[PDB]
Structure formats: structure tokens, C-alpha cells
Design a protein around this ligand. Sequence first.
Ligand SMILES: NC(=[NH2+])NCCC[C@H](N)C(=O)O
Ligand SMILES: NC(=[NH2+])NCCC[C@H](N)C(=O)O
Ligand SMILES: NC(=[NH2+])NCCC[C@H](N)C(=O)O
Ligand SMILES: NC(=[NH2+])NCCC[C@H](N)C(=O)O
Lengths: 136, 395, 398, 394
Amino acid sequence: ALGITGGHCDHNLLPPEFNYSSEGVVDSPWEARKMVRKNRKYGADLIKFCATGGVMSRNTDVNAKQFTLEEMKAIVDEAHNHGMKVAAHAHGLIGIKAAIKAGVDSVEHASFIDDETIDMAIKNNTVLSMDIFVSD
Amino acid sequence: EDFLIKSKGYLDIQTGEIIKADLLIRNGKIAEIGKINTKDATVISIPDLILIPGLMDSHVHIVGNDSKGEESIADSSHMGTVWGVVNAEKTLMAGFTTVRNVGAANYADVSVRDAIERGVINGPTMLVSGPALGITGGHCDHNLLPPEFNYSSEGVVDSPWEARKMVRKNRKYGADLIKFCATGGVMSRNTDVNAKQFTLEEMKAIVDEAHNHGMKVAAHAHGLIGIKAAIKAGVDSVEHASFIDDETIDMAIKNNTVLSMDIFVSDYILGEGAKAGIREESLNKERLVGKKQRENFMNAHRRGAIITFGTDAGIFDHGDNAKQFAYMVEWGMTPLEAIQASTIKTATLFGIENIGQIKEGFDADIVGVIENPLANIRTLEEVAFVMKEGKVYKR
Amino acid sequence: SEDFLIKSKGYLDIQTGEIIKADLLIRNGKIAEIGKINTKDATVISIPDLILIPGLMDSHVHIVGNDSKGEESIADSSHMGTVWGVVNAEKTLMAGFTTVRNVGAANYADVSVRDAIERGVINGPTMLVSGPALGITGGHCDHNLLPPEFNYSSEGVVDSPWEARKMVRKNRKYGADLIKFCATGGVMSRNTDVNAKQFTLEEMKAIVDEAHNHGMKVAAHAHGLIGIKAAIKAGVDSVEHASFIDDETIDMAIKNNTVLSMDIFVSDYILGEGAKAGIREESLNKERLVGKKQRENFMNAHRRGAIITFGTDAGIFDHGDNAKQFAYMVEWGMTPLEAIQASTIKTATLFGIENIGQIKEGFDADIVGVIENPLANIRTLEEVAFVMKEGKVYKREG
Amino acid sequence: DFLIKSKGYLDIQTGEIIKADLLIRNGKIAEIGKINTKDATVISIPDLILIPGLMDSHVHIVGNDSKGEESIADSSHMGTVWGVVNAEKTLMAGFTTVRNVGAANYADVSVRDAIERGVINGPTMLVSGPALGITGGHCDHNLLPPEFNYSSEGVVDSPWEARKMVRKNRKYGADLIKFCATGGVMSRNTDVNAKQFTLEEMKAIVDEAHNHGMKVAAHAHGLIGIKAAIKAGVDSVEHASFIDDETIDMAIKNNTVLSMDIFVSDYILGEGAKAGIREESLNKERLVGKKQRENFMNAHRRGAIITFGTDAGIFDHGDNAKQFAYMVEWGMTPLEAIQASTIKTATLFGIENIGQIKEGFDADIVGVIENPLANIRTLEEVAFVMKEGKVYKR
Ligand SMILES: NC(=[NH2+])NCCC[C@H](N)C(=O)O
Ligand SMILES: NC(=[NH2+])NCCC[C@H](N)C(=O)O
Ligand SMILES: NC(=[NH2+])NCCC[C@H](N)C(=O)O
Ligand SMILES: NC(=[NH2+])NCCC[C@H](N)C(=O)O
């Protein structure tokens, strides 16, 4: 999964002395581009990125957008260029909005989606992939 | 644990009026204002001491090496953390309950903040910045080594995406807050104080990314072009702000850019600091900056700009933060407005609500003082009672 | 000028056992005179019912390290270990320990805390520090808590004689007083055989020769017998723990002036109030192997005539509670006088420091004052009432 | 609890098969004798002879078994997926404790621990980590151009480097140390009759592993490397292909086991030739194969300990018992061949309480149709597998 430094799909479990980032951590449009290429190269069928923070990660904010829209658009263009679909992890609303705008194929979780951006997903044929059991 | 505080009176920091009433404290918050019934737990008889909210400093460097001389040259970064423990206690006993740390290395600032937060040690509630962000060779670079070492400091960033990433890295590792340098400085080697550092594009990228995570942004800036650009980039405070003029005071007003103007510390640097360790290149830049800053501090206050209590403690001794109160009133603030700048005005800037007022529901940060501070403000230099978050630290 | 006259119930002579009624003159951080002193300018410590002994010592502490627990503590930096170190140094002082041997830490932050004590930045005992402990790859003072993908060895991992040479030199360069190595496996580490020697003798003899070349002392961690034998043969100044020492190698230790720093309290913490408090079950099973056998061998060590010092492995248990071992030391077969001797003059000789560990003329003013007589009840060392270090008073109750 | 009613069990010490019943509680043989009393449940077998669970002292369970064009850029994780398959295949063939003798990335220890924890089915593995070797050796990867400068994990080239890698293998969970002491068949660019490692390097490995209580196996075809492995003091020499009269006697005196694989040559030169094995390897097999099982016969005759080791991985996992026929063919009694795969291996592995149907020993029990002392080829199709008191095959 592609993420920002310290994102949901980074690994924020080590002291800063280790300087660990996970395999898919990317922090520019062209880095993000390259990671889509690297995933395709080694055989991936789709691209996942993290667009907000999440529940299971340390030190992430669920309502904070992760990635600029510029980075998000780069991930989506490059993946669609190779005929890959794009899923985007997004709990908070500003992330959901931004993922849809970038042109993602599915938004994962989609937890705080409002009326106006439900309709954004309808209009763009964006799918909501929503895990409503797992909270229990 | 419950506390009834028997005061000479509390300052109402909104109105000015001091109010003779009692305060009930339960679990780190002010419960009651008025005359209170008293059934369970303990009384603090104070009665000679007029009560004010816990004070704030918006520009400190609590963590750093304060050992000096020949013995201290090969000292590891951990000596700076030892001193961090010391200076935090010293800052709390001076009646400062919530501060904004504005540069450290190695996330030792978050180490000292969290230890206070866990009750491992005593100190103020630190808002910490992590490594400050600079251009190669800037003010918050370290320009003290030969080119053969090729040493750059932790926050050195040189493109918008590099800067984006360091904001993220600082968020990852605990920072509350991004500080960056937008001009050259006084205390650094090889920096022009009137030169802009960072492109506008670099600056905007820092701000955009930090605000995206709900982090506030502070910019170090003396020179005018730097101040303008920082304001234009959309920062939450300009630090120092030394050569601010009529037009860009106005730019700051329309944007809600706080000015964090350290008007004491020039007198320490040009006075006691000349033999205390401070380089001659640094003293020459302080002559350029010092007088003109408080001239412009007076102008900014007159024109209506928001100014908060930041001192650059760490240059001068921690504990002596309160010495700036007298300077603040000397250069145009009323005594009320000087205390407002370390209570209600910092609290907005810090982004923390429920501090800095003696109001019901607010956090029990309270400092007891000898005289009437609206008459003599230099009482804040000699405090007799410190409560932070319900617990009593000084009596 | 700024001198102290201490008026007390008595002072212990640590060579004899005698409690002597005398006053003490303190100048320039030293005990100047003992007896009746004519003075009119010196300020008087009136401390009339307190018995005085010299400042206590610990030959095995870990003052610096993170003592924060739970889920919030996980990505904490190394500087949180230094913040805790400050707290723990103060806590060790207030329990009447005035010179200690800090026997393993990371990043030379042990030398920082030490130096900041030396400079009077913070209150604490005089630490003698090791630096990073030298270990083999995957040894007890390696860190085996990470997947092989990380390929993390800790700071002091060495695997050849000339590598071990180089780490002794590096430790010294960054300010260390002594060298600790692990010679066997250990209780508190993951995947270490307590009964297996770690290091070759060649590597052990290289560590020792270099450390002694620079006038540094060597401690060796060794539970298992083969590693005790090898440490002694290499020429170490102390074997730490020494848990499965036998008759023949007690005799070796006597012969070569090898000290035995035997932490005999701490097994009651780990199995008791430590199994509840987050010690892993792999460690506890190794603790069951060690603890009772160490105390039996502690008794046999003393009676056969080996030098034992007072080490606790504090840091495992709470700093400040070091003196709980004193009870455990009369239990397992020292006289109360020998117990304090182990924490004063016997430690001083191990430490290589002259002019501490006695209330004597010319010696440093490291002086602990106590409520009951410690030769009658040793367990009042667990609640001291007066602490003086280097002329300065740090604890006084009444 | 379990009660096993049986045609009889092999007493592997005496050779005489004993008609009795076996009581299994807590994964051990509790009672041998006549019982059918109390607790839990009978196992209705009747017609099967019982033997102690079979052991292989030279396997390679983890590794990619996919072939051809698809498999070329496969990650190391494919070899781990295959390890899960190959563990079951080994266990269902009646092999209950095995020695895995060289994998990469510590995937062997993973596969082991997964079996131990009950995540997956398989035998108890003792694992080596990466095999130690010189640069360019048999257990170096000799298949990439110079510009890559690739060397595999266990490449060491000094005594102290070797020491360190033993320590690294221990650290990440290895039970034993394999090293390569000559060149090999299945590698590119190795001479089978040339020693690899100095004696001083070999002694450094042996001394360091024995210090941690780890057994040492040394790969050796050529004679001069077999000699030097024994003098180093290894616990086994694998293959042992060109061992002579004089240094068989060295192996008897020093109690060095010879883990000789005498089946696999016939796979390599037959079905393996068209399976994608290189001509350089096939040529080196023709140097080794015939003379190995000749020297097997001489080693057994002179009094040397030989264990059952097969080099499975080359052939398909689960076909391991095909070697048993070859071992009687080349000089052993059928008892001696099962002795080689039970009590001889248990001593080599350093594990007490397996390899025997005796009281207090672990419940590793395999049921077979015919008498194995009659025809040994019954072990090629076992009917009943029990490992640690759990029944895996019926
Ligand atoms: N309410 C929920 N769907 N919770 C589960 C969210 C799981 C997701 N991987 C996350 O950590 O954000
Ligand atoms: N007039 C002043 N505020 N002087 C102090 C400036 C301190 C600042 N950190 C700098 O070096 O630039
Ligand atoms: N019984 C004892 N001495 N227990 C404490 C042992 C502490 C030592 N660091 C170890 O893990 O080996
Ligand atoms: N005759 C034999 N045992 N042949 C098989 C040898 C296989 C061994 N792994 C090697 O490459 O050398």
C-alpha cells in the first residue's frame, strides 16, 4: 500500500533512531508514480493507497487527509495508464472527497461520507467498499 | 483530591477587574467561582496572594546543552536532555505552565514533553516543534564545521516535496507544531538577517502540509522580505518580526498572523551575553536588530496586531522569562495587555482551549503573586505559588 | 568558612565494627577531623540520635533506561531513557548510595548523566559507567527482539579479538570508566542459553588486556559455570551474578583476586512482582533455573573466602530499593558488618577509587545517617534519614 | 488418550517384533503391554505392524518447486508456500522428525515454528539456517555475472567471519550448522574433489557451534574434504562419497556419522536429466554416484555409523522411503536400515525420547502393512502415521 511518511500504511511502531518507513511510503507525485510502476513490475493487479489516517495504526488522525491531491492524482493516472484499478483507504470526509476527485475506483471504509459526496461517488461511478461488521 | 484556594482575589483577564472570590479545584479543573461550601477536602490558605492564570511563553528552547567550556565540547546530545529536565522544572517554578518549545534535535523535545505529560518529571505543558526546517546554510542549519564534513542539521530541506516530507516526519515522531526559518538569524554563523530564506513555493508547501494535519506553523523572520513571504505563505506566527513595517503589520492583521516579538533578550545579548559565550558576528547582528524590533513592536501594537509573549528563553536563563513583562509595558502595552499576551493570546495561538482564564471548567493552571500586577507588573518575576493542572508545585 | 560540624549518636568504624562517639569536621568535600573540634565559624548539623556509616555503594546498577510502560511507551526515543536516568540517579542518592557502578547503557548517555552529576547540573551518586556492554552476535547484551529483516545488532556487538579491542578503545574514547562484557547467556534476554559460554577465551583475553592497558576494570556477566571459569582465566576484575559457581572456581576467584558481584535479592522481584508486571515467560523459566542456586552458591562463596560485593541489578526492580538486599545478605550467611563492608570498602577496592568507603580523616564526605543501629538491625538501611555526598547535604528528615 | 491394538510393534534394539498394545497419553508411550482398560479411545488397527516414526537427516523442504517460464522472477516467499506443502508430504510419508539442511532467509525456522505452534502440519524440523560456505563454493550462488557481485547469505571467508555467522544463525533460530567442505553436484563451477575451507576455518565453525550445543553437518564428496571435516570434529559428513578405508576408521574413532544419500543418483541421471538439471551437474553425478554406494558398503562393513539422509527436494518430497530398498541392496539388513532412520538419527539429531517404541518416549509411531524385516518396501506406502500422539494418516 502507498502512503505518506507517518501515514496509516506506514509503520509508526519504532523509535526515531531506527528511521523505519514501510515498503510503500512515498512523499512526492513522481515517487508515487515510481512505486505504482514498481508494484506493477513485481506483479500487482491493483493499487491501494491511504488517503486518511486509520483505526489500527499508531499516531494517525482519522479526519486528517494524507497525501496532497497532486500526489493522489499521480497515483491514479499512473495506475489507470497500466489498466490497474485504484482503491483508496479513507475514513474522514476530506480524504474521501479528495480520493474521488483524483479518480479512484473504490473508496475503502468511507466512514464519514456526506450527502454531497455520496452523490460525487454516484456521478463518477466510484464504489464504496464499506466494512460495517468489523467494528463489533 | 480536591482543593479550596483562599485568595486575596483573582484577575479576570478579559475585563481587567480583580475579583475577590474563592476557587474550588477538582481533578485539574476550576469547578466553582464565588463563595463555596467545603465538605470534603483540603484548603490552601494563601491569603496575601492575588491569583492569575498560569503564564505562557511562545518561544522557548528548554532542551539543549547549557554546559559550557572546555569540558563540554564532545558532550553527546543526551547532555542536552539532562538539561531539558532541569530547565523544564525551572520554567514551571517561574509560573509558566504551558510553553511552546520551538527547536530541538533528535525528538528530545517530545521525550521531555511526554515525560512531563506522564508525570515522570515536573515541568510546563510543552508544545514541541521537532527539528526546525531550513535551507542548506540557513539559520536553523549548523554552519560551524568544515566543508569536508558536509554536515547538515536534521530539518534541512531544499525543495517543496522535501519540506512536505519533513513536516510528515515530524508529525510521525511527535511534533505539535512546525517551526521554520524564513530569514537569517542573530545567533547563527554565516546568515544575513535581511535575506529571505526559502522560496515562497517552499514556504507555502510547509504551511499547506502542516495545516492539513492541524499543525500550527511558526516562522523565524527578522528581515522584511522574509516576514512578508511568511505572512503570504499563511503562517500562524512570525517569530521575532524585527523589521516589520506599516504595510505588513496590516498584512498580518487581515490574516490573523500573530507576532511573537522577543523584546527583552537584546539587553541580555548586548549586555551579559558578550562574555557569556556569544560570538562577535552575532553581537554585530544584534546591534542591527535589537533597537529597531521594539520600535516596531510599539508600532504593531498601535496599529492593532496580535502580539504574544515569546522570549527566546535558552539564550537567557530559564526561569528569567518574566523579565520581559516590564519591557512589554515600556514599549506600549498596558499591564493588562502584557498578561493577556501570556494567557488568552497565547492560548488561541497554541490552539488549546480551556486554559489561560480563571473561568469555571478551565484547567487549574494558577499562579499566586504578591502585589497588584496592574500596578506593578514586575511581581511576575517573583512568584510565590504555582499550581499546574491542580497539583501544587511552589509554596 | 563553609564548613560543617556533624554532631551524632556515633559513627561506625568499618574495619572493626566499633561505633565511636565523635564529631566530624567537614571541609572542601572531605572529612577533615574526627573527635572534639573547637569551632565558632562552622555551621552545626545537630543530628543527635542518628548513627553514621559511610556512603553505600552498588556494583551493578542500570540507572539510565526507559522505565515507562504500556502501549504509549513503544516508539519512545533513547532520550526518554536519559530523562528517566535523571530521576533514577536522584532516587539512588536519596537511599544513601553515593558511588555506584552503572554497568550497561546505550549511546554514552550513561557518561552524560555521570558528567551532569559531576558538574552539579543534577543530584545523583558518583557513577562509574561502562558504555555499551560488549557482546557476541545474538548474545545476552545483543538485542534479539527484532525480525532478521532488520538485521539489528546493538551498539556493542563484537565478534573477533581485534573488533573487541576496537570497542574497548571506542568506549574509552567516549568517556567510559570500565568495560562490561557478557560471558554467558542471561535471564532477561530473548534466546540465550544461561549455561552456554559466549565469546571465545581469545576474545575474552583481548577485551581484558586492552581494558587493563588503559587502567579500566572489567566486569563479566556470567551465570553458567563454563563462562565463570573463562572470565576468571581471562583475568576479569569481577564476575557479575556468578550463579553456578562451584568449589574449584570459587578457589580460582580467590586466587586471582576476582570479585563476585552477586545479585541475590532480585530473583524475588522477577518471580514475585515481575511476572505480573510484563516480564516474559521465557525469562521467568530461566529465572527459576538461576535464583535459588545462586543464593546457595553465594553462601558457599563467602564461607570459602571469596570477595563478594554489593550488586543488585537495580533497574529490573525500582531504583531506591537497592538496600533491600542487605536483609538477604545476613539471611544467606554474612554477618551484618560484612554486609556493609561489601557495600563500602570492598566495593571501593573493586571500583579502584581511593579515599571513599570509610569515615576516616582525609576521606571524601560521603556519609549516611540512620535511625537504628545497623549492626543490630540491618533493615534500617532500607529507610535512611540522612544523606551527605561530597560535603553537601541531600537528605535530612528532622 | 489412546489405546492402540496392533498386529505388533518392532523392538528396534533387539529386532524381534513384539505383539503388544500401546497406551498413549500426553503425546508419549505410557505403557507397553496388554491393556484395554479405562480412559479414552481404542484405535482399531488390527493388521498393521508398528515401527518408530521415520527420520531423514538431509532434506530441503523449503524452496521453489515451480518450474519453467512462470517461476523466473518468483520471490523467496514461493519457496515458503512450497515448504508448507512439502512438510505435509514428508509427514504423510511417515517421517516424523527431519533435519532441514540448508534454506534461505530463515524461512526454514519459520516453517519449523509454524509446525511447532500447530499452525500447519508437518514433521519436527531441526533447521540449519543458511549453509556456510566460501566465496564461489557449493553453497554459494554461482549463477549470476561478475557485475552483480552476488554472494549468498552464508558466504564466509575467514575463521572469525564463520564464527559470526554461526552466531547469526543461532540468533535467528537455527538448531544446527551445515557447511560445505567440498564442491558439489547440483552447483555450477565447483570441483567435487577439491576441498573448500581451510581446516582453520572449519575448526572455527565446529568450535563455535559446539560451544552453543549445536550439531555440525559438513557437505563433502571428495576425500580430502571428508578428512578435513572429521579432523575439524563435525558430527556428520553428508554424502561422504569418496571416503576410503583409512578415513572411515577416522570416522569410527571420532564418532563422526556418515549421512549417505544413495537413492538420489538414479533420480538425477534418469528423470532429473529431462527435468531441467544442467549437463555439468549430470557429468559430476556420474563421477560420484556409483562410487558413493560402493563406499557406503565399505563404510558399513568397517563399523561406521550411517544415518538415513536422502537429499529430498531434488526428488519429490514424500518419496523419501525409496532409499530404504537401496540400503539393503548395498549391504544392510532391513533392521539396520530402519535402525539408520530411527535410533541412529535420534543420536545424530541430539534428541532424547524419540526413535523407539519404549516407555516414556514420544508417541511418534508409524503403521505398516507387511513385515518391514521381510520386505522393506512397505515403508514406501505407510498406512498409519502418528506424531506426538496426534494421528495424521489413516
Ligand atoms: N469501523 C471500521 N471499519 N473499522 C476498521 C477499520 C480498519 C482499517 N484497516 C483501519 O485501521 O482504519
Ligand atoms: N532582538 C532579538 N530578538 N534578538 C534575539 C534573536 C534570537 C534568534 N533566535 C536569532 O538568533 O535570530
Ligand atoms: N537471579 C538473578 N541474578 N537475576 C537477575 C539477572 C539479570 C541479568 N541482567 C540477566 O538477565 O542475566
Ligand atoms: N550421489 C549423490 N549423492 N548425488 C546427490 C548430490 C547432491 C548434493 N546436494 C550436491 O549437489 O552435491
